[PDB]
Amino acid sequence: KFSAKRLPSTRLGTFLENRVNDFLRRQNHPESGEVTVRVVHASDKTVEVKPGMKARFVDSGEMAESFPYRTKALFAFEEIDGVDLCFFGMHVQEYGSDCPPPNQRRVYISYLDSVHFFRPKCLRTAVYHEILIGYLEYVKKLGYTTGHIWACPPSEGDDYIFHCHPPDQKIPKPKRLQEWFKKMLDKAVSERIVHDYKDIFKQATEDRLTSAKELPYFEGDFWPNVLEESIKELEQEEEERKREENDLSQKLYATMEKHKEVFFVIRLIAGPAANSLPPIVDPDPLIPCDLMDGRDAFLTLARDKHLEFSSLRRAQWSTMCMLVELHTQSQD
Ligand SMILES: CC(C)(COP(=O)(O)OP(=O)(O)OC[C@H]1O[C@@H](n2cnc3c(N)ncnc32)[C@H](O)[C@@H]1OP(=O)(O)O)[C@@H](O)C(=O)NCCC(=O)NCCS
């Protein structure tokens, strides 16, 4: 059988689904189904500093040329009427205790995506939040100190993870998505999972950040590209001054303040306890899976095989195909 449940389990997946199903049992809703969470990709990667920053800080020996991280893809499924539905997906980047500053003991949510067919409807959002809170709960247990989120909804017609969303699934505007993450984080705060959280601007200020090299630097994130753009801005200004004869940090602080409400810095472990921690040891094995290495492969598979997630029934058929692919691609 190629069911969701028969996908190879992990500590992380097991931890998440157990949290969600305990939550569902507590709600005792007659329409809810069993939820399965599976990590379907785990691999070692590195993000390398782009030219501008390498020139400024890497060649200077002030900053590592690259940072090692593990990427994970995980999906949540719901069984209803004995039928699998994939309804939530998320890719994360995890920077371990071996990672150089400024990235060590940090996790970053690359992207998350959903299709709105969870049953019952009235528990959908709560379940998403339980997945996210459990994730923060879990990495906090392993010893990561900080979580990072870039609250950015997809542009018109773009799919983050699931090809062809339901036409009537509304896409939240920035402010709504922002409030959504806050509600999730506030729950995590009341559960003493999250210590506190701040926008990127307030965090930098409190941390007394003085140099771009101090900003966490993640694969595909907003900040490495604004830094490259900022540096080219400096170069062109320098050229203006050249003609006339014939600060990075202040550019960054300015950009940080401008877009502060989109970027969350989430403190899992703060203060002293964040300083005498054992190495991070991840009990889960690597999980090679070309289909789920970042998001393009699955979008591409979906397009190629016409797997839409645009209705409940289309989503379930697509879910079956995805699962068959995940099962066979694993098999040797
Ligand atoms: C982020 C996400 C998982 C949240 O799903 P959610 O828990 O159902 O919350 P939403 O904010 O989307 O929807 C909540 C309600 O607001 C409504 N809503 C959403 N966007 C809206 C909009 N632009 N205008 C008016 N209403 C909107 C929804 O219809 C929903 O109504 P309902 O509860 O009465 O059914 C989902 O919106 C999603 O998958 N978005 C695409 C990917 C993404 O944005 N990822 C975040 C960046 S990493």
Q: In the chain, where are the structural domains located? A: 1-332
Query: Residue 39 — φ and ψ, nearest 5°?
Result: -80, 120
How far is residue 240's CA from residue 81's CA, in Å, rounded to a whole number? Answer: 68
Q: Which atom of ligand 1 is nearest to the CA of 114?
A: 39
Q: Which atom of ligand 1 is nearest to the CA of 129?
A: 7
Is 174 close to ligand 1, i.e. is its CB under 6 Å away?
A: no
Q: Is 25 annotated as a binding residue?
A: no
Q: How far is the CA of 318 from the centre of ligand 1 (A)?
A: 22
Structure tokens that stand for 319 in this block: 């879910």
Is 114 close to ligand 1, i.e. is its CB under 6 Å away?
A: yes
- Resolution of this entry, Å: 2.1
Q: Which atom of ligand 1 is nearest to the CA of 173?
A: 23
Method: X-ray
Please state, in angstroms and as integers, the Cα–Cα distance from residue 224 to each residue in 45, 231, 252, 267, following that order: 17, 11, 11, 21
- Could you tell me which of 285, 288, 269, 266 has the C-alpha nearest to residue 277? 269
Q: How far is the CA of 128 from the centre of ligand 1 (A)?
A: 11
